[PDB]
Design a binder for these strands. Structure first.
Ligand SMILES: [Mg+2]
Ligand SMILES: [Mg+2]
Ligand SMILES: [Mg+2]
Ligand SMILES: [Mg+2]
Ligand SMILES: [Mg+2]
Ligand SMILES: [Mg+2]
Ligand SMILES: [Mg+2]
Ligand SMILES: [Mg+2]
Ligand SMILES: [Mg+2]
Ligand SMILES: [Mg+2]
Ligand SMILES: [Mg+2]
Lengths: 81, 87, 150, 206, 96, 54, 97, 217, 129, 25
RNA sequence: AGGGGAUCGAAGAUGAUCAGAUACCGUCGUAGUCUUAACCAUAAACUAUGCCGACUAGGGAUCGGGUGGUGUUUUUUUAAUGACCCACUCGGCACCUUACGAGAAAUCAAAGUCUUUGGGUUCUGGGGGGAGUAUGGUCGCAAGGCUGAAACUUAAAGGAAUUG
RNA sequence: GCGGUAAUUCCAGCUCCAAUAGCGUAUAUUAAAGUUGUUGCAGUUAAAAAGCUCGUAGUUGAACUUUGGGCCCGGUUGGCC
């Protein structure tokens, strides 16, 4: 193209590129404030939890680990941030 | 280049590529110079007055002179919304 | 990449640009510290403590919330081990392969992998002895190796 | 640097979309993506209709910038582009090369078909690469009626369109010819539609 | 880095590599082993005197066909015997 | 082969137009993103966005 | 000079595959380098079917087929004309027919 | 009686373009040797060598002769011509037209301070044809041409009067060596120098100026 | 592995100029690279360049202007006297009137010309012309 | 003068030469 | 050196075949082929292309992993999961086009970023024979492996491509 | 490479050339040799990437710590009695 905004890449470009190859590299992960139906508490968990997280009341399962993002235990209510 | 007493002593000064700022030498027989005739009201040609762009053969060989004209014409106001600086 | 291989993967954790973090985590830095101390008293390595904090809590990084790192916390309150975690895992890997080899002598692939593991062990141990973490003349004997992993 | 009456007007847009020249190619290469419009499902890409018109106006300015209309060469080698180029010859100067290009026409100064143009316009870069490649030896500006999957080597100016459409090819030549005559003292009234219809720019079978 | 090291403190490696690879040169090898003084009829000398043991007629190599008329002499300094050409038309009557 | 009579009858039979047809309005299946394109360009048209099946 | 970019075989990233003996001359050749041909054939031939079927119980039952994967060496392929040497520019083609 | 066949020929015979510099500036292709002959009346040629060449046939050897010719006034213009033909005289002739058609300029400068006319080259240059690579290095006044005789004559016919040469490869291959030197001197304008850092109005072609006179009917 | 980030930076600039790109992206942007680009920018070989500040080492986006023939590095950083600048410039620079041999001396990063008029010398970094 | 068979010849020569030197040794 | 020895099969037998064959071919057939414990350490051990790192051009296909589609698909109509489709993405085996560039050329996305010659590092070569020989050393039961000349002799040996 | 019956190459005569009170020949060395290589070679096919991996000496090794601005003194081309 010989000319392009390397300083100001398109948001679509930065979204579709790899997390290491962006201009200022950062994670595509996040945190969930997620509601387990067991009790009145809110549990803050990782997106790619890589473990079986659990709370004091719902002390069996909350999300099961996988290769990438952890799969929620099919009854919770998640929210980002 | 000038001699001792001013007096530019150079066998000609060559054109430069408006795209890549490369000198177009004599045997660059793939280099072009495109002329865009001016326009007044009612869309007339008004012959004799041009906007000239020199493209070097190297850029043209790479299939990469079209976007260079897009950038240059967008800069000069020949075109409204043909070139996008960000990508 | 891949010190003792040919693979060229990257597979890294790209931490956020923000050195001050994370605008939603209202727990106190003190309370985080004794959480860290509690899991370490249970007997978890700094890496395991880090993943468990990051999972069960909102602790994005220990060093952005606490003024220092997890190992620095453990050294501060006198719970850091003698052998660093990476070295100890390397030694226990070597111990497992050595026992496997003694049972199966004709595993030349295992013998090759064992040589690679011990070379990684010796390089890491040389570095630790340079930074004076391990005492000078700390050797990986490989005949008293299993006693160092217990 | 041009007046605002040059913009894409609804009647030109109506005839444009009637020709369906907004339909692009299934796959695009890096030099045609400045004209992409976030393709439909089934993979049929669509084109910046405004950019097509704007490049058409710029190419028309190039054509009506050579003092002699009789040393502009229009290359076509496809059955859809034949009649369009011949009518382009009837209305502009624009001498044609239809059917075979007869390799050795810009070089080889002793051929019968030896021409020395100031500007060459090609209907299809892929099927007219012979003219484009030969003109690259003798400095001839190239204006190509490109598609999304078309080569851009030595292509000075590109007007994206649909190259699989007989209506699209004929209408682009019609629009280019109309703007060329408008950019001179032959089509002075630019607001009125030109007296004829692109029906005979369109290639007619058999 | 195309082969050779480029370290500012790698001069030892560079010079020893050159020293080892210098033996492949023909004249350097011959001069450093001193074959001229050991294995040559002349002990590294431009000329040498001798005594004509006999005359010899050597048939020239192909594609030529001629007799070369050399003389087999025996050097004084080394005792080594060698054939020496007698270059001109004639001159075999002068050598005896 | 090309003679003047043949080229003249060719011009006569090429100049013939079949009246007004094939471009007159019959009601343009201008799909939704093209409608978005022309409305971004700010141009009026006979809006007809159709939803094809699978 | 090198004659083929892929030397004569289909082996990149292996270093060894297996030998497979030629069905004609019994030469041991690598399986990737072997010229393999499927021979799907009817049971008898195109003219016997009439008399075979009019003398057959189980009318028009199946006309069974025989299946086998012949492996040829390069020399036998040349000799029996399965490969039929091509030109320098035409040898890069890889289409079956 | 020469009838021009190309637009450049018409605008040259009519006297519209009176200097080679317009052709060079606009990089206009030259297909007629009369054009270069007209614009450079004092264009002298010279023949480097004639070499025999054999093509084996069914019977005997079809033998052709290849001549290399260097042309050019000492004002900074050179051409190089390779031609193979049945007869040596015809080979010399056609090589001279080819050398005329292949005339390109040169960039002269100073090793120097700014004093006098440009004697040496402005920049170190190199060309490479075949395996041969020929390098030209600016030299002070009085050094002369420091080169093998074939390259030295070509440099003299270029008008360079002070230069160092450094050739690598099979320099005994004359045609490759001469072509390499031709490339090296031709690149004297392909190189960019701080004294050429300014901007120019990008003049229109004389073909555009006199389009009417060209293509007479 | 990585041994001379300046070498990689100058190589990237050279490749961009060769293919005609009017800009290049540079990683990992040491302050030596910063000084070296400042010397180019003062002499007009490159235009405006940008330091993108990631918290690890930084990237750089340089705007080129088609005015650079070769920007190179001299590895190793040979120690040069004032009596060696002339031979280094003769070996590297295509002429005597233009081109610069970039040195690192105690007075800082600078070219051969201003090094000579300051009458100091250090190690050699690279060349540009 | 196939190289393998020339290699075989020099190996045969080496064996025989060592054997004939054995009696002197 | 033990076990095992079905098949094939250096040596060999035996039939032909030849001008001859102790060659090709047919039929047998010891060692071997397989395994255990020890030796050997060589292959056109090849991608004839050392390893690490960055940049430079376009494309689709596939493998492993992941991310995102109110995508399709089954079993309860449709859930989850699984399989498939599409777009990204990291890593891998490669492939297609072109000549930016490279090469003596064949060709090469590396064999590019090299007289505009310097990212780091290891190994090897200096016309062809003699010769991987002699000798000395070392390793091996052995066959041999590693190291390794010289005297003398020659004007060529060779690489890629063109015509016949 | 010439010499086998016309030898532009041998033995001679004539003519001519080059250097010149000097000019050949032999051996050694230097440049030519970017055919020893830091500058500055080559290793797919010409001679040459160890079969492959580890690893000590050796060589090499990411980024980062005072930047910038202002004030004064003060040397030089010369620019105009
Ligand atoms: Mg990496
Ligand atoms: Mg062959
Ligand atoms: Mg193998
Ligand atoms: Mg070997
Ligand atoms: Mg090998
Ligand atoms: Mg040598
Ligand atoms: Mg040798
Ligand atoms: Mg060499
Ligand atoms: Mg070979
Ligand atoms: Mg070889
Ligand atoms: Mg290898």
């Amino acid at each position: 193209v010989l000319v392009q905004d390397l300083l100001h890449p398109t948001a679509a470009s930065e979204a579709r590129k790899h997390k290491l190859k962006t201009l200022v590299q950062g994670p595509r992960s996040y945190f969930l404030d997620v509601k387990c139906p067991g009790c009145l508490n809110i549990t803050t968990v990782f997106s790619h939890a890589q473990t079986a997280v659990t709370c004091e009341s719902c002390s069996t399962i909350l999300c099961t680990p996988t290769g990438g993002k952890a799969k929620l235990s099919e009854g919770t209510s998640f929210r980002r941030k | 280049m000038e001699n001792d007493k001013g007096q530019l002593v150079e066998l000609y000064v060559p054109r430069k590529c408006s795209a890549t700022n490369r000198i177009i030498k004599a045997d660059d027989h793939a280099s072009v110079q495109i002329n865009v005739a001016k326009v007044d009201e009612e869309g007339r040609a008004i012959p004799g007055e041009y906007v000239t762009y020199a493209l070097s053969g190297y850029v043209r060989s790479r299939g990469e002179s079209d976007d260079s004209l897009n950038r240059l014409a967008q800069n000069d106001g020949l075109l409204k919304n043909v070139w996008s600086y960000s990508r | 990449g891949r010190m003792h291989s040919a693979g060229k993967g990257i597979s890294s954790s790209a931490i956020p640009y923000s050195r001050n973090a994370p605008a939603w985590f209202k727990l106190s830095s003190e309370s985080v510290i004794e959480q860290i101390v509690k899991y370490a008293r249970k007997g978890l390595t700094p890496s395991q403590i880090g993943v468990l904090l990051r999972d069960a809590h909102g602790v994005t990084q220990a060093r952005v919330i606490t003024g220092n790192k997890i190992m620095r916390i453990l050294k501060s309150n006198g719970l850091a081990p003698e052998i660093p975690e990476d070295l100890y895992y390397l030694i226990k890997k070597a111990v497992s392969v050595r026992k496997h080899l003694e049972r199966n002598r004709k595993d030349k692939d295992a013998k090759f992998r064992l040589i690679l593991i011990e070379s990684r062990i010796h390089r890491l141990a040389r570095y630790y002895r340079t930074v004076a973490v391990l005492p000078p003349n700390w050797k990986y004997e490989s005949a008293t190796a299993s006693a160092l992993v217990n | 640097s041009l007046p605002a009456t040059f913009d894409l007007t609804p009647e030109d847009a109506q005839l444009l979309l009637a020709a369906n020249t907004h339909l692009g190619a299934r796959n695009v290469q890096v030099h045609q993506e400045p004209y992409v419009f976030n393709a439909r499902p089934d993979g049929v890409h669509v084109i910046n209709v405004g950019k097509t018109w704007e490049k058409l106006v710029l190419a028309a300015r190039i054509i009506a910038a050579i003092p002699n209309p009789e040393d502009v060469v229009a290359i076509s080698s496809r059955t859809f582009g034949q009649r369009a180029v011949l009518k382009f010859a009837a209305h502009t100067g624009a001498t044609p090369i239809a059917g075979r290009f007869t390799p050795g026409s810009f070089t080889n100064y002793i051929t019968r078909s030896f021409k020395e143009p100031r500007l060459v316009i090609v209907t299809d870069p892929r099927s007219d690469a012979q003219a484009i490649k030969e003109a690259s030896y003798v400095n001839i500006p190239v204006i190509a009626l490109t598609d999304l999957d078309s080569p851009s080597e030595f292509v000075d100016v590109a007007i994206p369109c649909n190259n699989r459409g007989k209506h699209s090819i004929g209408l682009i030549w019609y629009l280019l010819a109309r703007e060329v005559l408008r950019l001179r003292g032959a089509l002075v009234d630019r607001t009125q539609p030109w007296s004829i219809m692109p029906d005979l720019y369109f290639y007619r079978d058999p | 880095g195309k082969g050779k090291p480029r370290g500012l403190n790698s001069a030892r490696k560079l010079r020893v590599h050159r020293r080892n690879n210098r033996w492949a040169e023909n004249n350097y090898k011959k001069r450093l082993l001193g074959t001229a003084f050991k294995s040559s009829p002349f002990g590294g000398s431009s000329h040498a005197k001798g005594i004509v043991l006999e005359k010899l007629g050597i048939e020239s190599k192909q594609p030529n066909s001629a007799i070369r008329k050399c003389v087999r002499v025996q050097l004084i300094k080394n005792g080594k015997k060698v054939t020496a050409f007698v270059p001109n038309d004639g001159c075999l009557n002068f050598v005896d | 082969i090309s003679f003047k009579l043949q080229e003249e009858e060719r011009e006569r039979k090429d100049q013939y137009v079949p009246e007004v047809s094939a471009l007159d309005l019959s009601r343009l299946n201008v799909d939704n993103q093209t409608s978005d394109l022309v409305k971004s360009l700010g141009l009026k048209l006979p809006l007809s966005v159709i939803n094809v099946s699978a | 000079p090198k004659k083929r970019a892929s030397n004569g075989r289909n082996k990149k990233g292996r270093g060894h595959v297996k030998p497979v003996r030629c069905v004609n001359c019994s030469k041991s050749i690598p399986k990737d380098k072997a010229i393999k041909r499927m021979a799907i054939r009817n049971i008898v031939e195109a003219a016997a079917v009439r008399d075979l079927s009019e003398a057959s119980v189980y009318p028009e039952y199946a006309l069974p087929k025989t299946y086998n994967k012949l492996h040829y060496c390069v020399s036998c392929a040349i000799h029996a004309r399965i490969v039929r040497v091509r030109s320098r520019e035409d040898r890069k083609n890889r289409a079956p027919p | 009686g020469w009838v021009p066949v190309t637009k450049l020929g018409r605008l040259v015979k009519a006297g519209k373009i009176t200097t080679i510099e317009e052709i060079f500036l606009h990089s206009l292709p030259v297909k007629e040797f009369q054009i270069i002959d007209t614009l450079l009346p004092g264009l002298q040629d010279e023949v480097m060598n004639i070499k025999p060449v054999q093509k084996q046939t069914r019977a005997g050897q079809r033998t052709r002769f290849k001549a290399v010719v260097v042309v050019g006034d000492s004002n900074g213009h050179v051409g190089l011509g390779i031609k193979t033909a049945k007869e040596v005289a015809g080979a010399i002739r056609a090589g001279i037209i080819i050398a005329k058609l292949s005339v390109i300029p040169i960039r002269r400068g100073y090793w120097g301070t700014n004093l006098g006319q440009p004697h040496s080259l402005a920049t170190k240059t190199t060309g490479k044809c075949g395996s041969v690579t020929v390098r030209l290095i600016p030299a002070p006044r009085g050094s002369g041409i420091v080169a093998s005789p074939a390259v030295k004559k070509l440099l003299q016919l270029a008008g360079v009067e002070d230069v160092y040469t450094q050739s690598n490869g099979k320099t005994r291959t004359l045609e490759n060596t001469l072509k390499a030197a031709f490339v090296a001197i031709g690149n004297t304008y392909g190189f960019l120098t701080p004294n050429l850092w300014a901007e120019q109005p990008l003049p229109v072609s004389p073909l555009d100026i006199y389009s009417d006179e060209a293509s007479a009917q | 592995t990585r041994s001379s980030v300046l070498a990689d930076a100058l190589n990237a600039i050279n490749n961009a100029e060769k293919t005609g790109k009017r800009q290049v992206l540079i990683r990992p942007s040491s302050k030596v690279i910063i000084k070296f680009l400042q010397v180019m920018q003062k002499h007009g070989y490159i235009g405006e360049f940008e330091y993108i500040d990631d918290h690890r080492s930084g990237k750089i986006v340089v705007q080129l202007n088609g005015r650079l023939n070769k920007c190179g590095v001299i590895s190793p950083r040979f120690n040069v006297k004032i009596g060696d600048i002339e031979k280094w410039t003769a070996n590297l620079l295509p002429a005597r009137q233009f081109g610069y041999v970039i040195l690192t001396t105690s007075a800082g990063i600078m070219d051969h010309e201003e090094a000579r008029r300051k009458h100091v010398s250090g190690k050699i970094l690279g060349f540009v012309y | 003068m196939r190289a393998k068979w020339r290699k075989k010849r020099t190996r045969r020569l080496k064996r025989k030469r060592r054997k004939v030197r054995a009696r002197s040794k």
